[PDB]
Amino acid sequence: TNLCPFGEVFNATRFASVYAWNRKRISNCVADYSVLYNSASFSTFKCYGVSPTKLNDLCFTNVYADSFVIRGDEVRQIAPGQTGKIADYNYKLPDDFTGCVIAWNSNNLDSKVGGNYNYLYRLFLKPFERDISCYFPLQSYGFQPTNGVGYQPYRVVVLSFELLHAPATVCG
């Protein structure tokens, strides 16, 4: 009864840029979701399609966990059926969304005094596109603890749940 390894998913020291977002497939383990509901420390807990307390009693063939870091104000840009900077250039999301969205503060880790220029965004998609490639069309965020709330570095993970013709691999 090996757990699904979410300690390196949530408590990774370095995530990725939003144009190179880290997707990790999760299969063949047991996963606990109610402790992620009752962690009581996430600035954004939103679960689409299905309630998070009842997710512990469900089974899924494949999970895709997508991880990136965005600004403050555009946590509201994570929805299906909308427009936005992330929604057009960085991470577009399909309208049939049964996965769930967790975001939290990372001013403590993803920013520092004097500027954090770690992360990169497409300043110049279809759903689930990771776009790799006279200006260069990309820019870098400027991250300070003295930056504003909408300027704050937040970490976002997105859980995509799939049922296929395979037998079920991830349960609770």
Curated annotation (Swiss-Prot):
Consequence the record notes for mutating residue 121 to F: In strain: B.1.1.298
Record note on what altering residue 136 to L does: Increased resistance to neutralizing antibodies and human covalescent sera neutralization
Effect on the protein upon substituting residue 7 to H: In strain: Omicron/BA.2.75, Omicron/XBB.1.5, Omicron/EG.5.1
Organism domain of life: Viruses
Residues covered by the BetaCoV S1-CTD domain: 2-172
Region (Integrin-binding motif) location: 71-73
Glycosylated residues in this chain: 11
Disulfide feature: 4-29, 47-100, 59-171
Segments for region (Receptor-binding motif): 105-154
Region (Immunodominant HLA epitope recognized by the CD8+): 116-124
Effect of residue 139 to N: Reduced host ACE2-binding affinity in vitro
Region (Receptor-binding domain (RBD)): 1-172
Stated consequence of mutating residue 108 to K: In strain: Omicron/BA.1, Omicron/BA.2, Omicron/BA.2.12.1, Omicron/BA.2.75, Omicron/BA.4, Omicron/BA.5, Omicron/BQ.1.1, Omicron/XBB.1.5, Omicron/EG.5.1
Effect of residue 136 to S: In strain: Lambda/C.37, Omicron/BQ.1.1, Omicron/XBB.1.5, Omicron/EG.5.1
Job description of the protein: Attaches the virion to the cell membrane by interacting with host receptor, initiating the infection. The major receptor is host ACE2. When S2/S2' has been cleaved, binding to the receptor triggers direct fusion at the cell membrane. When S2/S2' has not been cleaved, binding to the receptor results in internalization of the virus by endocytosis using host TFRC and GRM2 and leading to fusion of the virion membrane with the host endosomal membrane. Alternatively, may use NRP1/NRP2 and integrin as entry receptors.
Record's subunit section: Binds to host ACE2. RBD also interacts with the N-linked glycan on 'Asn-90' of ACE2. Cleavage of S generates a polybasic C-terminal sequence on S1 that binds to host Neuropilin-1 (NRP1) and Neuropilin-2 (NRP2) receptors. Interacts with host integrin alpha-5/beta-1 (ITGA5:ITGB1) and with ACE2 in complex with integrin alpha-5/beta-1 (ITGA5:ITGB1). May interact via cytoplasmic c-terminus with M protein. May interact (via N-terminus) with host bilirubin and biliverdin, thereby preventing antibody binding to the SARS-CoV-2 spike NTD via an allosteric mechanism.
Name of the protein in question: Spike protein S1
Species, as recorded: Severe acute respiratory syndrome coronavirus 2 (2019-nCoV)
